[PDB]
Structures are given as C-alpha cells and as structure tokens.
Design a protein around this nucleic acid. Structure first.
Lengths: 192, 64, 144, 59
RNA sequence: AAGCAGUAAAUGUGGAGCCGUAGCGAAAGCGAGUCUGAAUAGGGCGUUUAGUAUUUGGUCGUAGACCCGAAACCAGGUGAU
RNA sequence: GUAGCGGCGAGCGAAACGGGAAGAGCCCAAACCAACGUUGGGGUUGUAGGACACUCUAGUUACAAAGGACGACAUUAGACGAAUCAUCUGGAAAGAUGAAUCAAAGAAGGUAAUAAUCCUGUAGUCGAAAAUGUUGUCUCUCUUGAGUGGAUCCUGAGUACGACGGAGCACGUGAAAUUCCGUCGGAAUCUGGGAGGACCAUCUCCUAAGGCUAAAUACUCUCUAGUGACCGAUAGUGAACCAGUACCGUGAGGGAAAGGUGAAAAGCACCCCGGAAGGGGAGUGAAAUAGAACCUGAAACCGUGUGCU
C-alpha cells in the first residue's frame, strides 16, 4: 500500500534537467516535410526580358527573380530534422525526478492486480471511481495486458503503458499515477 | 564537410605542450659567404610563431 | 506542470537580427562598413592571404620527416599503482580491464613519476630506469 | 566497319603532350591491311591486322 | 557511431572508435625529464599539468551564402518566304 | 582530413585491420577412353589436382541440365455493425439549462449554428461467380560416392613480359610497384610460374592469359492506405477556372489573366415612367446596402450639403 525506496521515488527533482528532457522529447515528434522553390527550381525564366541599356526601364535578368510577382523564394523552409541527443546518465536522472515529484503530491497509488477476463470499458470506469482518482490517470503494468489496455483506451484523459515504456511526457501530463504492486518493484531495479 | 588542414603549413611548425607553435628560421638555404659567423651560428636556433601571426592562421592548424 | 515550465537562469539567449531598423544599431549597413570588399556578398580574402605580400608559411622552410615504423606505448606512472592489493600480480591484461589503461597502443611502459606505496610484482614490456629502482625497493620483483 | 577480321583490334583516343605539357586529343589507329583469306564458302578481301599475320597464315 | 528491438515516438541495448591522465627530439630513443653539446657548463620547450559529453549565443571555413544587375565564353539545335 | 600527391602553390585525397547488414557456390579447355569439323564419355586444381594403375552398397528449373501434373493464404465489387429525450434564445440547435445512455466504437466528414448516442462511418467480426500473384505438398524429371602407390603424361601463346608513345590507380614520370590501349621484339612448363611499392637474395602467401551466379544497395512515371508546430488565391505546381489553352514568332521556342449570392432558387407574378437599358413600388427571405459587374468592402481618386474663414 505505502512502501518507499528513497532512491528512485525520494530524491529531490532536478528541475534544470527536467526542462531539457521534456524539450528534447517534444522536438523529436515533429516531421519537417516543408520546402519551397528558389530561383533555379521555378519554371521558365531563362532569357533576358530586355537589353541592359536603351530605355528608361530598370535592368533585369530574368522574370523569376525574388522581386518579381510569382517567381523565386530567397530563404524558405527546408526538409530537416529537429532531434538531438543527451548523455545517458542525464536521461535516468530526469526520469527519477518525475517519479519523486508525484509522491511529493500524494499522487502514487499501488493496486493489487487486474483480473479482467474480457474487455469491458464501463467496469474499468467503475474501478477508477472506487480509488477516487482525478480525471487524468496514467496506468502502469509489468507487461502488456490487452484487456487492461482495451477497457481503458477509450476513456478520455486515461493513458496506459508498461513499466519499461515510461517517459517524462506521460508522467508529467498525468494528474495521478496508478502502478501495480509487482510492477513497481520492477521499475525500481531498472532505475539505479 | 570537415575543414581541411593546410598541408603546406603542417610541414613547417609543431605544436608545443602549452599551445604554441615552433618554427624554423629563414636565410639558411645558401649565400653563406655574405653572412658573419655569429649571424649564421645564432640562426640555427628555433623560434615560436609571434602573437600577431597566430591570429591569422589559427584555423589553418585546428587539427594539429 | 507543462503550463509552468521554466528553463535555467542564463542558459538561453535570443539571436541577433540585422537589417531591421535603425533603433537596433544593425540596420541599413548591418555592420559591414561602407563600399569595401568585405561589405560585398560572397566573402573576402582567404584566411592566409596577406594582400600580396609573401605569406609566413611560404617564407619559412620545411623540416624533418616521418617514420613508418613508429612505435608508441601507453605510459603508467608509479602513482596509478596504489589501488591494487599488496603483493598482487599486475599484468597488461588486467590494467586494460581494471580502468587504468583505456587503449593499449603498442604495449604498456611503466614510468616512475611518484612513489609506489606497495609491494607488487609487475609484468610489462618496458620499464623506466627509475621505475624499476623503486619497484624492487618496496619488495617483490618486476619482469618483462 | 574498320577493324581486324581475325581479332578486334581497333583505334583508341589519347593525348598529345608538348614540352610545356599541353594536351591535345589524338587517335591511335591500327595497322590494317587488305588481304584475301580462305572463308568456308570462298576467299574474300578483308581487313587483317599485321600482328595476326605474323608467324604465318593462309591467304 | 553504425546496427538490433520499438508507435516515423526517442527508450533500452551496442565499447570498433574519439578526447584526457606526460613531455622532449628531424629521427633511432629516452622519460619528470628531454634536445643541442666533449661537458646539468649554459640555453630552448615541458614538470603551471582537470578533464569530458550535450546544448543557447557570438565569429570563422566548405556549399550561390545578405538581395538585384553585365559587356562575354562553351555545348546541342532552329532558320535563304 | 591521417599516409601521401601538388608551378609541394591553389587545391586534391587513400587503403588495410576493428564493429555491422547479408551470406550457397559451380560449369568448361587439356591429358584419356569409344564412334564417321554434330560435343558421346572422362575430368576441374595449391593442407597439388587429374589422366593413368588401385579397397568398394540424393538433388528441383533464381547459378549449379530442364519441359509439367498436385492443396492452402492474399489481390481486384461488398455485407452486418452499440447508445437521447425535454426546456430557453433563434429563420434554423449540435449551443445554454436539467435528467438519461452506450464504449474492443470519444478516427474523421456532413447535417438551416459548436453532435460519442440524427446521417455516412469508426472498433470488431464475416464474404468471392470468375480472373491474377505468392507459396506448401506429393507428383514429375535428373541422379555412384571415400579413390592408400605413383616411374611416365595434362592444364588456357604471338599470350606473360620488355622497349617506345599515351591513359588509368588518392599518387602530375617521379626511386612508381600493381592495372589497360596502339606499334614492334618476344618466355618458361611443377626442379615451373606470379606477388609482398625500383631492384637482388632468403622466407612467406597464391596458381594468370575461359565462362556463369541470388541476397544485403540505388531510383519513382504511376497505384492503395495514410502523415505534417507545410501553402491558403500576388501564396501553393506555369495551370483550384476544361492551361501548356488565350496570345507572340517563318520556325526551334516563349506564355498569361480568371475562386466565394442563399440553409434552401425559394432568381423579384403583378402595377407605373421608358423604343430599350435602367429605375420606383409590390412580393420572396432571418437579412435584396445578399439581385448573379452578387460574403466582408480598406486607401488613392471623383462628387453633393454644411459650421468657421
């Protein structure tokens, strides 16, 4: 019901490392897929509109220049990536800081197990009412459980994952944390 | 791509332990009958790149 | 807490933009000067260019050569041997897995920049004239 | 249709070098000669190289 | 690092590899010392010796490289209404 | 960006080890044994092979020789598919205010306004006359492997290589090995021949002058599903409109401008002025300063009236 470790759930959250961790996971989710045409990519515009001298017009060299209507982009978007790396030790510390931040708010509850024989969403919703949880809840499990994930994915604000598939975005987003008794010990040895 | 090293400059200097560069001397190829004995003897010693020339060729030797 | 994020103090700064008004100080000219080669788009002279005078590297002569059969060794002073047990046997195979030698280039050479503080038996390829003087003075015996 | 009948020797291309090392494209032709050789139906006039005609042959 | 397993998640594995802990000499080589020299006689460069990974900002290098503008050069084609 | 190359200037620029993806290897010429320049056997190489003398009960047409008969999954139309009723403001409810519901379905798009329960769909679960593709089975064809001696025999020639003139290897003829083309001269034969960066000796590792071979790699006209801290009508493909079309040139070629009434045409029956165009009433609609030169309607610019001057 209430057991502590003080080394994976009791440390003081390092907020300076938590910021970079959340910012790093938000940049890897975006695909660029944007581009524009330039002087050479636009269609046509090979000849010169008129000669250099012999009239009161401004000198030009092509009808697809930047200052022309409908021709040429100077510096636009290009297809690129936004992901970057971070030392391994800094990754584990940013994760232990999120788990401890929750226990500091009385937001961690350990349950016995799940005996869902078949997928029923209403039965899972009644379970969350007995524990008196907030509107957004993150459920953790030792290993994949199709019924536990099936009967819960449809409820709004409810997310279900595994012990080894946790990240700082889900822990920070969830208002409460619900983790199984046995699964809790597994997450302990992994974080060390 | 990575920057390329000035191969001509890598054949004339070496990097010391404190970040300096050791070089050779000039007026040492020929015409020794026009120079004094003291002048030629003291030219066999090495020197270091001056503080003004380092500001111009810093990146030229960034990999040495 | 995603609606209250706060970065560290002094870890982020905003980029400078030139050519966006006079109140910034980097407007029309943007910081290039007036009617020069360094003010044109495309760059200027190369790093080592001296404007026409002979470059320093051309003035200086070449020196030396390189050896194809250059052998290098990983030095280990008598100061890094204060962690093993008294009388233990130290071998290159151990030094590369204990944490003292990260990469054995062409063998381990033991130098004498310090005191041993223990009695050990060392096995290496080369010993400094002063490394063996102090290894055999604290007991034990070295070997190649 | 300019190549040896007994082999595949033909011409190639190269460079012409001067004292100053200037380059100019040129050709390297083969030593072709008209000869009448035995063919299964009857003899004919073909182009045969001088290298193949060495050491003896039938004509 | 590539790769492998993962939601195009960015986590877990992966220690070939790179930098640092020791310099000096063209080199053999020696080593908290080394080079020059008959000579630690003197002098030169070292023993000052904290580093390393990721990232915001400034500047430089290779790419058109802050934007617009030539007189020309070469290649393949179209034209004696 | 190391070795090295370079009017050693500007500049150019390796490989082998080590870590990975993938991963099988075979068929001929020759010696020889039988037939009158069809291929019939025999045989394929370095911890030396074969001919020649000698012990003697699986493979599959993607290389390795190739021609078919035989069961199951997918592709090209579809089908079924849970759960809502009132009140207030509206021209209209999905909004607000109350009470009920389904979820392995709260992805989306429509519907007179902002819908999990109104509509088409989604989760999930089913379906194929006939025609393609991928395969699995037996069928079908084709199929003798270890060979201890070892004197005599066999391998691929105007080739290997050298000189001269060129090119190519990171390497500009340089001390330039290794690889190619043209012209001439021209080797050896298992006690042989080639390489290890000129060249010689020793040692070590290989066996040229015949051929074939899947997988790990590159690319996208055009398909079927999807995705975006990408564009939103001077933007995005030149082209959201029937655009390579108006137009220009003898020709090869060059090349635009042009989206929006309303929820629903419900697109103003009828009267009046006028030759018409246009307009004033009436009527439609929530709104006609929403009447097709039709959402919103900025500035330049052009008019009328007026307080002070």
């Amino acid at each position: 019901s209430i057991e502590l470790s003080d080394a994976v759930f009791g440390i003081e959250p390092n907020n300076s490392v938590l910021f970079e961790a959340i910012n790093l996971q938000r940049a890897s989710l975006r695909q660029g897929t944007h581009a524009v045409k330039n002087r050479s990519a636009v269609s046509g515009g090979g000849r010169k509109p008129w000669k250099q001298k012999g009239t009161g017009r401004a000198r030009q060299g092509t009808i697809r220049a930047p200052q022309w209507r409908g021709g040429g982009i100077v510096f636009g978007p290009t297809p690129r990536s936004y992901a970057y790396k971070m030392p391994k030790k800094m990754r584990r510390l940013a994760l232990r800081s999120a788990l401890s931040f929750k226990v500091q708010e009385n937001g961690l509850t350990v349950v016995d197990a799940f005996n869902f024989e078949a997928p029923k969403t209403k039965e899972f919703k009644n379970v969350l009412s007995t524990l008196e949880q907030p509107k957004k809840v993150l459920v953790v499990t030792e290993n994949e459980d199709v019924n536990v994930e099936l009967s819960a994915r449809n409820i709004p604000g409810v997310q279900v994952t595994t012990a080894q598939g946790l990240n700082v975005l889900d822990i920070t987003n969830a208002d409460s944390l619900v983790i199984t008794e046995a699964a809790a010990k597994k997450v302990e040895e992994v974080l060390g | 791509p990575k920057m390329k090293t000035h191969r001509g400059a890598a054949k004339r200097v070496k990097r010391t332990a404190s970040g300096q560069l050791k070089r050779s001397r000039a007026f040492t190829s020929h015409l020794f009958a026009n120079k004094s004995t003291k002048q030629k003897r003291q030219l066999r010693k090495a020197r270091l790149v001056s503080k003004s020339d380092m500001k111009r060729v810093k990146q030229l030797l960034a990999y040495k | 807490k995603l609606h209250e994020l706060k970065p560290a103090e002094g870890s982020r700064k905003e980029r400078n933009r030139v050519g966006r008004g006079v109140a910034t100080g980097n407007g029309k000219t943007s910081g290039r000067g007036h009617k020069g080669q360094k003010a044109r788009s495309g760059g200027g002279v190369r790093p080592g260019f001296e404007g026409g005078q002979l470059p320093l590297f051309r003035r200086l002569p070449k020196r030396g050569f390189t050896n194809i059969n250059r052998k290098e060794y990983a030095i280990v002073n008598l100061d890094q041997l204060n962690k093993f047990e008294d009388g233990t046997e130290v071998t290159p195979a151990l030094l590369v897995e204990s944490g003292v030698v990260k990469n054995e280039k062409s063998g381990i050479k033991i130098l004498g920049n310090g005191s041993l503080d223990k009695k050990l038996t060392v096995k290496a390829h080369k010993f400094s004239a002063s490394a063996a003087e102090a290894i055999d003075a604290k007991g034990g015996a070295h070997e190649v | 249709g300019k190549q040896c009948f007994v082999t595949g020797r033909k011409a190639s291309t190269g460079n012409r070098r001067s004292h100053a090392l200037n380059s100019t494209k040129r050709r390297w032709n083969a030593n072709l000669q008209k000869v009448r050789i035995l063919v299964d139906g009857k003899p004919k006039k073909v182009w045969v190289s001088a290298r193949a005609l060495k050491s003896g042959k039938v004509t």
